[PDB]
């Protein structure tokens, strides 16, 4: 369901 | 409901997953996730004073740890910069993980990826069946099951 | 190093495990401890292939990759009736219903 | 008694390690429960409402559960076909496993 | 290698 969004992990 | 009950519920859910590891150090998580596929994850206790739980996850560049904030009755991933409307937050910590696993079914600085749990123990056959059913359908109240088992399925809606 | 097996004959299924490096003959001795028939009254099969007593299970195709606890490999079993062996016969398990609509 | 026999509704006989069958709370209460000391005790459990395709999958679960309990080995998925999940849920619930 | 502890940044 949730629209994919790129997630950086810093 | 009140917050203590909603949090009790979320922690009982976490205890059903089979992938909550309790007390587990950074190095132990790293050894367990070293050779695992990218996106393999588990939840463990945080050794930090301000956090209950931490996700350990195999990334692009190896295993890492993201603490889980619990604020205003909801769990959310630790973030370095945020906009309240943009950060996913849920009553249930398993809901939070499940949300990101569903999101990540679609695919320099490392990207977060979450796919499959690393089990500390084998869940019950009942719970494994519940997972499979949840992956097959969101609508369980029409299934040919006695209502006692429809209630059982309703206690844990997630696909992980 | 362990292989996980379903040894099947007629309406009998034995769930057991053995070392990949152990032999067909030793598996017959396991069967002997359970069904009370000696190895020379037993033939073991992988599918339709008769398994020779001296081969290891891995050499028969039962490997840790192909014979897992959650998905054991099937070994067929035939007993000797008096002078001649029965034909291998394994009764199939029952069948689930058709999947419901919302499946 | 290293092995116990579990018999399905359609009469298939599954011979499985006793320790493995104790994975089922229901079977454990039946075997490691009360009784009469001087009497013969059948080493077989009949299930009138669990058919063999379900009971065989249950026995696989027993093997899986025992292998991956108190083990350092990474735990692999236990595959469950959608076509069997409803019956398997009902049997697992009846069996308390 | 990624640091031991990280936090997210939605880009
Ligand atoms: Co990027």
Residue numbers in the entry:
A (entry chain K): -3 to 6
B (entry chain A): 30 to 136, 146 to 198
C (entry chain B): 1 to 103
D (entry chain C): 16 to 112
E (entry chain I): -4 to 6
Provide the authors' own sentences about this structure as they appear in the paper:
SOCS2 is the substrate recruiting subunit of a CRL5 E3 complex that negatively regulates the JAK-STAT signaling by targeting substrate receptors for degradation and blocking STAT5b activation by competing with receptor pY sites. SOCS proteins share a conserved domain architecture comprising of an N-terminal extended SH2 subdomain (ESS) that functions as a bridge at the interface between the SH2 domain and the SOCS box enabling ubiquitination of captured substrate, followed by a central Src-homology 2 (SH2) domain that recognizes a phosphotyrosine (pY) containing sequence, and a C-terminal SOCS box that interacts with the adapter ElonginB-ElonginC complex (EloBC). SOCS proteins serve as substrate recognition modules that impart substrate specificity to each CRL5SOCS E3 complex. Here, we determine the co-crystal structures of SBC in complex with phosphorylated epitope peptides from its physiological targets GHR and EpoR.
Encouraged by the success in solving an SBC-EpoR structure, to deepen understanding of the SOCS2 binding epitopes, we co-crystallized SBC with an 11-mer GHR_pY595 peptide (SBC-GHR) and solved the structure at 1.98 Å resolution with 19.00% Rwork and 22.66% Rfree. Contrary to the SBC-EpoR complex, which contains a single copy of peptide per SH2 domain, two copies of GHR_pY595 peptides were found binding per SH2 domain of SOCS2 (giving a total of four copies within the asymmetric unit). The two peptides run in an anti-parallel direction relative to each other across the SH2 domain, with well-defined electron density surrounding them both. One of the peptides (referred to as peptide A hereafter) binds to SH2 domain in a canonical manner, where the pY is recognized by the positively charged pY pocket between the central β strands and αA. In contrast, the second peptide, peptide B, has its pY residue exposed to solvent and interacting only with His149 of SOCS2. The unusual simultaneous binding observed for the GHR substrate peptide to SOCS2 SH2 domain is imparted mainly by the region comprising Ser(+2) to Val(+6) from each peptide, which pair such that they form an anti-parallel beta sheet. The Ile(+3) and Ile(+5) of peptide A and peptide B settle in a hydrophobic patch of the SH2 domain formed by Leu95, Leu106, Ser108, Leu116, and Leu150. Another hydrophobic interaction that is distinct in SBC-GHR compared to SBC-EpoR is that formed by the side chain of Val(−3) of peptide A, that nicely fits into a hydrophobic pocket comprising of Thr88, Ala90, Thr93, Leu95, and Val148 from SOCS2. In the SBC-GHR structure, a cobalt ion is modeled at a positive peak that disappeared only at 21 σ level in the unbiased Fo-Fc electron density map. This cobalt ion satisfies the formation of an octahedral coordination geometry with the side chains of His(+4) of peptide B, His149 of SOCS2 and with four surrounding water molecules.
